[PDB]
Amino acid sequence: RKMFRALMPALEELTFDPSSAHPSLVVSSSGRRVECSEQKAPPAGEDPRQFDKAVAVVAHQQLSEGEHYWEVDVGDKPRWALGVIAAEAPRRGRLHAVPSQGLWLLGLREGKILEAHVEAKEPRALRSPERRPTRIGLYLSFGDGVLSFYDASDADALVPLFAFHERLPRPVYPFFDVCWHDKGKNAQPLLLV
Numbered sequence: 001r002k003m004f005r006a007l008m009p010a011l012e013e014l015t016f017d018p019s020s021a022h023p024s025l026v027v028s029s030s031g032r033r034v035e036c037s038e039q040k041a042p043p044a045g046e047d048p049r050q051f052d053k054a055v056a057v058v059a060h061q062q063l064s065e066g067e068h069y070w071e072v073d074v075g076d077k078p079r080w081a082l083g084v085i086a087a088e089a090p091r092r093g094r095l096h097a098v099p100s101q102g103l104w105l106l107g108l109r110e111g112k113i114l115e116a117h118v119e120a121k122e123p124r125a126l127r128s129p130e131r132r133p134t135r136i137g138l139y140l141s142f143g144d145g146v147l148s149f150y151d152a153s154d155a156d157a158l159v160p161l162f163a164f165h166e167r168l169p170r171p172v173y174p175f176f177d178v179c180w181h182d183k184g185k186n187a188q189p190l191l192l193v
Contacts (some may be wrong), residue, residue, distance in 0.1 A: 004150065004158035012070040014059040014174055015193050020049050020091070021057035025178060035189035036181045043126065055097045055180055058085060058173035059192075068140040068190065070174060071152050075134050077188035078111030081177035082136055084147060086169050088154070097123075104164050105175070106136070106149040116149075116162040126162055133161075135193065142170060 007155035023044050024189070026037040034057050044052035051057070053159030063084070074080055081097070082105060089102025097103045097117040105117040137152035148163035181187045 001154075001155040001159055004160070005156055006135070007035060008069045008158065009067050010069075011193065012061070012068045013176075014061050014070055014166065016057050016176070016192070017060040018057075019047065021050065021052045022053075022055040022178075024055055025057055028059070030193075032192040034104075034176065034178060034191075035187050036178060036187060038181060038184075038187070046122065047090055048090075051095075053089045053093070054177060056080070056081075056091075056173050056177040062087060062171045062173055063140060063142075064143045064171040067143070071135055071137045072176065073135050073191040073193055074108070075188055075191075076111065077108075077186065077190070079107075079109055079179040079186045080190060081107035081117070081175075081179070082104045082138065082149075082166075082190075083117075083175050084172040085175040087171045087173060088169075099164060099166060102169075103175070104147050104168070104172075105177070106162055114161065116164075117118070124162075131168065136161075138174070139169075140172075142168060144168055 016027045016034045018027045024036050024041045086102030114126040118124045133151040135152040137150035139148045143169040149161045151159040
């Protein structure tokens with residue numbers, strides 16, 4: 001676990017793109033914090049760059065080649081999804097979280113079920129396994145065609161959770177789904193480290 005941590009490249013400098021965010025979301029802290037603003041959900045704009053059904057947002061930064069690593073603090077947020085979305089993938093309407101349609105995601109449900117959104121009709125449940133992760137690390141390598149996820153809760157260690165190995169298309173955008181607030185039960189923010 002100590003090796004993984006050191007083998008990772010410098011932390012990617014990312015910022016949430018406000019123009020792509022679902023209308024219920026608000027971006028703050030110099031683009032490093034995003035959460036649902038429970039006031040009066042306004043209608044989505046006419047720009048296809050903005051998610052209108054998925055309560056998500058992408059980073060300003062597009063990735064096309066090389067290796068990249070970034071971390072996201074999720075804390076005790078019970079429901080979220082993280083990964084990347086292909087630049088050519090649709091962002092409007094109900095989205096289908098499968099690689100074939102441009103989404104490569106790892107998500108959490110009920111605050112305890114970690115699942116990989118593999119090419120299938122049902123996500124693959126993974127092992128927590130010991131303690132609820134509070135920070136997720138994402139490693140993207142175009143040369144190796146992989147997107148891997150790690151439990152990055154421990155400052156000096158990384159525990160593998162899952163990895164997509166099929167060749168990845170380019171470019172892609174780091175993707176973050178905050179999900180519906182679930183009657184105030186899932187109001188926690190997603191934060192870029």
